[model samples]
Target: TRTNEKVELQELNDRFANLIDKVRFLEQQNKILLAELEQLKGQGKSRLGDLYEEEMRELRRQVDQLTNDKARVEVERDNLAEDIMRLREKL
Candidate 1:
């Protein structure tokens, strides 16, 4: 009976050790998943910010082109008005 008790105690100790190992492995896995979650959160914001910046750049380029075209049109209008005035004076 004493030997049987010793065997049962040994089995309990082995089972406890396995539980500890499983707890440790689960803890490590939790830490790694948390780190990955942080990375994904940061990546989502970075991707959105990059797209916002790209659109802003495109808008700026379009605005610049329109401004240049407006300036050219104004200059041409003024030159044509001057020619009209000169032609009326001759007539």
Candidate 2:
């Protein structure tokens, strides 16, 4: 009977060791996943920076276009005033 008891104890110890090994493997995997998530967050921030740069470029282009348009309109207005003065002199 003692011999049987010893065998049962040995089996229980072996099962416990297996469970411990599995737990260690899972813990390592969890750590690796956490590290990967952190890396992804860093990469996402970089992408946002790129988006901001693109927005700035687009805004600059729009401002330049509007400035050119304003200058053209001012030139037209001056020419119109000169034409009106000549017409009045003809009268």
Q: What is the lDDT of residue 83 in candidate 2?
A: 99
Residue 25 CA displacement from its true place in model 2, Å: 2.2
Stretches > 4 Å off in candidate 2: 48-60, 86-90
Residue 27 C-alpha lDDT in model 2: 100
User: What's the TM-score of every candidate structure?
Assistant: 0.69, 0.62
Instruction: Write candidate 1's Cα lDDT for 1-91 as tens digits.
Output: 6999999999999999999999999999999999999999999999999999999999999999999999999999999999999999999
Worst 10 residues of 2 by lDDT: 1-10
Q: Which residue pairs in candidate 1 collide?
A: none
* The best candidate in terms of TM-score: 1
- Scored against the true structure, residue 44 in model 1 reaches a CA lDDT of 100
Q: lDDT tens string, model 2, 26-88?
A: 999999999999999999999999999999999999999999999999999999999999999
- Among all candidates shown, the one with the greatest lDDT: 1
